[PDB]
Structures are given as C-alpha cells and as structure tokens.
C-alpha cells in the first residue's frame, strides 16, 4: 500500500424493511451515498433521504438505522466448496457462480454474475502459484510436497535429484511460513530453478500448499497448484460472495446461489429494538402502522429514559387515517416522549417519483427536522418539502388536533407562494395545564437541563470524599451553577431565597424553583382603513 | 523500468527502492515511489522507513 492519490448533537435512529445489510445489527450511515450501498431498496432508503433533504438548511444529524427482518443468506455446496452470500434477502437468489479449469493455462477459472448492480466478474490463473524446474547436468530431477496426517495442512516440501530428497523446507513452522523465502531459496541451490507467477501478487503461506509428488522434469517446468490457498487471495475484498472449503475441488457448470431469504415479518419488535439502547440515539422513528409495535416503542423510550438516558419518538399510523382512528390510537398512546402524526402526502425524490406517503413517512420527515434544529428550539412553524398534502383538516380540527396533542401540518397562502409549515411541537400526553410534557421543546431543553446537572452533581458530591461537606454546600453550589446557566440565557432567573436543602445519613433531599425562557403564542392585529383628502 | 503500479506495491512491501513513471499535463517526470528500507517490520518505521 505504497503512498498514492486514488481518485448535529442530537443523533436521529430509523428502524423499517429494507432489501440489504445484515440485521439485528445497528449501523451508522456516514453519507446518503454509503446508506444505498448498504440499503440498497425499501421504506428505510426513502426514510433516510427524505430525513436528510426535508429543507434545504434545517437538516438531519447523524443517522442510526438498521433493518428489521428474519432473512437468512443464499449458499449452494457443489464440488469442493461451499459457497455462500454477504448479501442476505431474496437479491441473493440472483447471484450465479461457475468454475472451468482451462488449458490454455492448467488453472482454474471463475465466473461471478450479479445482474442487480449490473456486476461481473471472471478470474483466471487461479492456483497455480509458481513454477520449479531443473537445470543441473542431471538425468533426472522431481520434488514432493506432503501434509500433516492431522490437519492436513502442509508440513514438507522437497527438491529431488531424480528420486532422492535434496533438501526440506520446514513448512510446519518458523522462516519458510511465506512460499516467497522458499522462493528465494530455491534459487540458493542453483542447480534448480523457482520463478514467480506474472500474473500479480500471491505471497501465499506455505502450510497452504497441497501434497504432491514425483512430477518429471528437467526441460519441463511445473507448479505447485495450492487452489484454494489461491483462491483466499482472489477473494480477499471481491465482490458479495465468500467460500468455504468441506473433501476436494472441482470445476462445475454456471448455478444459481439459492436459499435468499428476506424471512417473514417480525412477530414482535422488542428483541430487534433492543439493539438501540446505548447507541446514543435521542429520536427514534418506527417505519410501520401496526400499534403493538408503537406500543413497544413506547416502551422501549420508557425503559431508556426512566433509566437516566433521554429518549423520544415520533408515530404515525398507515395511510389517510380519520379523526375516530387518531383519537382512539393517542388514548392507547398517551405518555410523554410519544408524538402522534395526523396527516399523510407526497413528496418528491430526484429519481422523477411522486411518492404516496404513509403517516409514519410524515413523521420521519418531522424527526429528520427536530434533528436538524438545534438544542431547544422548536419545530413550531418550519416549512417542509410537501409537493401535496392528503387531508380531511381544515382550520378547527387544527385546533381541535393541536388541543388533543396530536401534531399536524398546516396550509398558508402567502402574497404569492403557497407552502407548508407545520403548527406545534405538542406532545401526545394531554393535559395541557403541564407544558414541561406537553411541549416536545420544552421537554428536550428540561432533558438535557437535568442531565448536565445530574452529571455534575456526580463530580461535586456522588463522588463520595466524604460526609463533612454538608448542606449549606450544596445549596451553594446549585446557586453557583444556575448563575452559569443564566450567564448562558437558557433559563431566565432563579430565586436563590426559595431553595432548601435537608440531609440525613448519606441523602439529600433539595428544593428549587427555576423560571423558564417565557415563549411566545400569538398575536392579532386591528387594521383599520380611513381616508383623508389629498390637495393641492 | 516496464514495472507497473501493482509491481511497485510487490517491490515496496519487500523493502525494494523502486521508480514510476508519472504523467503531467503535458510534461512528464519519473520519481520515487517510497522512502522504504530493507527492513521487514511493518510496524517499525524507525527501521522500516
């Protein structure tokens, strides 16, 4: 490998179909152009670039995604090998795979086909790694290789003057485990002969080598042939097949690799979910309309955040849902860290496509954009990518969606353009007295408050030094901590004379009382039209 | 100096001081591909380099 020239805080997580990438694995997408080389087709690749293009400024942050199914890869065992895919679903059921031993050569040959990427590929001088000869006045010359009666892994090789072993190379250990010092050393017993292979590098280890013997020579030259030790290196990085060997190779006609499987869908989502917990994901998104498995999602940011780590996500079910369905799916919805959607569409992709967009497309496209803004700021009011909005919303089911915690999007007819903007960061929970759970905003900003201090707090005091640092401390020290917080504006003041703090044993118990960063809902305007008399 | 750019990782990688021919726009000049030496460690640059 020779020098050369060769020519967002808050992470977002997806979980859908997707026709490519080995699941029950979490995978971190570092650019749209690596999510297609991994996600090749599916809910979950429209789900990524939709999240990433949902405005031309406000985009999504890192990406956390993985597929959820039961597929299974596609294998054949024919000949000496057995030969298996890298790439697991029904696209495996594609790919061929066809030996020839040739000739012209005395190597084998391979052909790789996969149509999908429109790929192929053929290999040729497969073994055959380097050539021995004699040139010594002698009648006669041979050599021999031989195997570990064990293993079966080669242990001996050996140049013969016509019959009889000249010298051995120890292959079952120690400075000849690379054939290339044998082939150095070969010629250190110039009577013989060793030459390199042309056709690119080999460098194979030489328990590898296959046992062979009394081959006739003196004009002729012959190889070690070594197939499958040659094969590893024809298919160290290539392509989306890998072998195994059982038993001996042979040659065999062009066959389709079978057995690709996507699998049947997954009865429950909880043991593929799981797989998220300590991935550092703050939304999590669901790609599918069943409720049991926004129920489990639910779950699952129940579980994450009463544990100390914060988590929230955004839900929507099937296609041009109705306000019985939206009322009846929030009351079997209702905890915080859950947003409910309420409108479907269509967006635009620049493959030239018009998509029919499912609720749960909506939210990923709202996700994408929670993502993007950074910490504390609201979604109130930021225009999307909608091409046409599918809906039976007018002005007072706004409200009366927007009062009942379900988000919506909302129609505006400025001078000239007409755009889409979506109203309130409301949450699913419904009680609207309680804007620290209401507000998905306000929610994040009081999540990340309390994470910082409960973080700082470990180092001041949870570190244990000892107990004679009492009360009057730690008072002091929330004081000092919530003037860091007011040099920095994201809460407003603090009543430093209303915090109290009582201990007992090793505990504390600690009141306090914070005023927020007030926001601001509306506005109405009286315009009054009047004349007056120009002169002259 | 027929050896290709494949020949040059084989020489380089056995600590074997090779040349390459190199294309500008119009111009063309011949340089040094590596600063390697005969040492065969390649997790030792104070003796492989």
Not at 316 to 337: I, T, V, W
Not at 383 to 409: A, H, K, M
Not at 413 to 434: A, G, L, Q, W
Not at 453 to 480: C, H, M, P, W, Y
Request: net charge negative; charged share 25%.
């Amino acid at each position: 490998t020779r020098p050369h020239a060769s020519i967002s805080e808050k992470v977002f997580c997806l979980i859908g179909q997707a026709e490519g990438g080995e699941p029950n694995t979490v995978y971190e997408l570092r650019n749209y152009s690596q999510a297609k080389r991994l996600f090749r087709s599916g809910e979950l690749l429209d789900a990524i670039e939709l999240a990433w293009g949902s405005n031309p400024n406000y985009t999504a942050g890192r990406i956390l995604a993985m597929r959820i199914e039961d597929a299974k890869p596609a294998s054949a065992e024919i000949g000496g090998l057995k030969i298996t895919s890298k790439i697991y679903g029904n696209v495996a059921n594609n790919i061929q795979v066809g030996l020839e031993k040739n000739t012209l050569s005395d190597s084998l040959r391979l052909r790789v086909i996969f149509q999908d990427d429109r790929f192929n590929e053929v290999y040729d001088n497969i073994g055959n790694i380097f050539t021995i000869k004699y040139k010594g006045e002698e009648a006669n010359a041979t050599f021999s290789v031989e195997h570990d009666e064990e293993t079966q892994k080669a242990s001996r090789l050996v140049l013969k003057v016509g019959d009889q072993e000249v010298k051995s190379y120890d292959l079952t250990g120690g400075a000849y485990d690379y054939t290339n010092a044998i082939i150095t050393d070969i010629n250190q017993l110039p009577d013989f002969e060793a030459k390199l292979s042309p056709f690119g590098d080999k460098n194979l280890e030489s328990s590898k080598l296959d046992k062979i013997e009394n081959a006739n020579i003196k004009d002729k030259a012959v190889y070690v042939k070594a197939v499958f030790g040659d094969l590893e290196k024809q298919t160290a990085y290539n392509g989306i097949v890998s072998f195994e060997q059982l038993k001996t190779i042979e040659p065999f006609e062009l066959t389709k690799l079978k057995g690709g499987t996507n699998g049947e869908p997954p009865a429950t989502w909880a043991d593929k979910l799981d797989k998220f917990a300590h991935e550092g994901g703050y939304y999590i998104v669901p790609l599918s309309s069943k409720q049991s498995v926004h129920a489990e999602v639910a779950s699952f940011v129940k579980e994450r955040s009463d544990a100390g780590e914060p988590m929230r996500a955004i839900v929507g079910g099937g296609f041009n849902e109705s306000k019985e369905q939206l009322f009846g799916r929030q009351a079997s919805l209702s905890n915080p860290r859950v947003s409910l959607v309420a409108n479907s569409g269509t967006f635009v992709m620049d493959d030239g496509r018009k998509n029919h967009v499912p609720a749960y497309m909506v939210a990923v496209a709202l996700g994408g954009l929670a993502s993007g803004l950074e910490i504390g700021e609201s979604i109130t009011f930021k225009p999307l990518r909608v091409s046409s909005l599918d809906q039976i919303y007018e002005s007072i089911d706004l409200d009366e969606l927007n009062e009942n915690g379900i988000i919506s999007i909302e129609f505006v007819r400025n001078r000239t353009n007409t755009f889409f903007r979506i109203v309130d960061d409301v949450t699913t929970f419904n009680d609207k007295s309680d804007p620290v759970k209401a507000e998905m905003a306000v929610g994040e900003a009081n999540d990340f408050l309390v994470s910082e201090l409960k973080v700082q707090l470990e180092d001041q005091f949870i570190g244990t030094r000892t107990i004679n640092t009492s009360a009057s401390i730690i008072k002091d020290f929330i004081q000092s901590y919530l003037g860091r917080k007011k040099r920095d504006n994201e809460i407003q003041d603090f009543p430093a004379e209303d915090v109290q703090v009582i201990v007992e044993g090793n505990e504390a118990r600690i009141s306090m009382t914070v005023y927020p960063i007030r926001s601001f809902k509306k506005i109405s305007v009286s315009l009054v039209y009047k004349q007056q008399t120009l002169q002259a």
